[PDB]
Amino acid sequence: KKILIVDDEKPISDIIKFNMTKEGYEVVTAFNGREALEQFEAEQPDIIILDLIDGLEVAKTIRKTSSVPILMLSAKDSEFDKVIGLELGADDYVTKPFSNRELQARVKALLRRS
Template identity: 60%
Template structure:
C-alpha cells in the first residue's frame, strides 16, 4: 500500500524535524520545506496527500501559499498558527485552509488531525466512484456522492469543508443546528478551535452559492442559535 505523503512547510527546523520524526513513525512519507516559495513549488510538484503549513514563513507567507495552492488543488491544508493570533486562524480559513492547530501543540493531537483530514479525503475519492445522488433545489444541484455542486448548471468550486457543511445542512432541510453541533458533526472530531470556524465557512459558502451573500436564500441564520438550510 502506498504511504500517504505529508508536506511540512515550516521554517523552524527544530519543529519541522520533530514533526517529521513522529509522522514517519506513524507510517507517513514526509517531505519538508523551510520557506514559502520552495514550499509552494513542492506542493505543486510532489502531489502530497496533506500540507502542514506554518503562517509565518520567509519568501511567501503561509496565507500566500494557501491562496495559491487553492487555485489549482483541493489537497487538505492544515495551518499552524500562533496561539495568540486568532486573526490568523480566521484568515487561513477564509483563504481555503481545511483546519488549523495552534502552537504549542501536542504531537498526538497533530497526528490525529492529519489522519482525520486524510481519511476524509480518501472517503470522498471512494464516494466519487459511486453513482450520482443528486438533491435538486431548483437552480442549485448537489451531488451527495460525487461531491459536486452546480448552480444554473455551472460547477461551483467548493473546498472539502464547505461541501461537507453544505451537504450536512441540505440533507436536513429546515433543521437548525448550533455552531457547536456543526463543529462536532461536520468537522468530525473534538474541535479545539472556536466557533468562528463555522461562521467563516458559512460566509465562504454564501459567497459561492448565493446571488447576494448579504441576502441569503439557502443557508439561513437563526439568530442566537445557529444555521439551517432552506429550500427557496
C-alpha cells in the same frame, strides 16, 4: 500517504517529520513559501502542514489549482488569525505549542475526509 511539512524553523520541522515518519507517512519538507510551492507541484502531497512566500499566500496559491487538505499551524492564536487562515482555504488550524497526538489525530481526520 505523503505529507509536505512547510516550516521555516528546522527544530519544529524535525519534530513533526519524526512523528509523522513514526506513523508511516512519507515526509517531504520545505522551509519557505517558494520551496513549498515547488514541492507541492513536484511531489503532489496528500496533505500539507503549513505554518503561517508567507503562509497565507501559499495556501491561496495552492487553492487556485488544488483541493489538497491544508492544516495550518501557528503560534498566533487570536480569532482573527484562525478565521482568516480558514477563509483563505485551510481545512484546520492548530496552534503552537501543539500536542503530538492531537496533530496526528487531526492529520488522520483530514486524510479520512478527503
